[PDB]
């Protein structure tokens, strides 16, 4: 869980064809971290995201 | 021979001590998924 990882996830979502904002991307990142149930680890399951 | 092949690939065909050490480290780290998961679990406290 790092800002670089958040930027990479946002870029991947943009490449997928979606339009995302900073708040929405941050909320997705926090929700992914919550789903992994680990403070410093975000969920790598990109299908669910 | 497989380890020497990996060391040559990582060192551009030359088996230096650095190349062989890097090859050994990469071989160990390739099979480190379970170790990484266990270590991050114990660091978070999932397994105390």
Resolution of the experimental model, in Å, one decimal: 3.5
Q: How many domains does chain A have?
A: 1
- d(C-alpha A19, C-alpha A28), whole Å: 13
Which residues in chain B touch residue A38, judged by CB atoms under 8 angstroms apart?
A: 40, 44, 46
CATH number of the domain that residue A47 is part of: 1.10.8.60
- What is the number of other CB atoms lying within 10 angstroms of the CB of residue B23? 21
Q: What is the DSSP letter of A47?
A: T
The number of C-alpha atoms within 13 Å of A33 and in the hemisphere containing its C-beta is 17
Per-residue HEC secondary structure of B7-47 comes to: HHHHCCCCCCHHHHHHHHHHHHHHCCHHHHHHHHHHHHCCC
What technique solved it?
A: cryo-EM
Would the CB atoms of B46 and A40 count as touching at under 8 Å? Answer: no
- Per the structure, the complete domain to which residue A47 belongs is given by 2-49
- What is the number of other CB atoms lying within 10 angstroms of the CB of residue A9? 19
Would the CB atoms of B40 and A41 count as touching at under 8 Å? Answer: yes
């Amino acid at each position: 869980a790092s800002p670089e990882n958040c930027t990479a996830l946002g870029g991947w979502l943009l490449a997928q064809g979606f339009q995302l904002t900073q708040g929405g991307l941050t909320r997705l990142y926090d929700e992914a971290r919550r789903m992994a149930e680990q403070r410093d680890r975000m969920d790598a399951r990109l299908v669910e995201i | 021979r497989a380890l020497a092949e990996e060391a040559a690939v990582l060192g551009g065909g030359l088996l230096t001590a650095e190349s062989v050490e890097q090859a050994i480290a990469a071989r160990e780290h390739r099979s480190f998924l379970s170790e990484e998961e266990f270590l991050r679990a114990v660091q978070e406290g999932v397994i105390r």
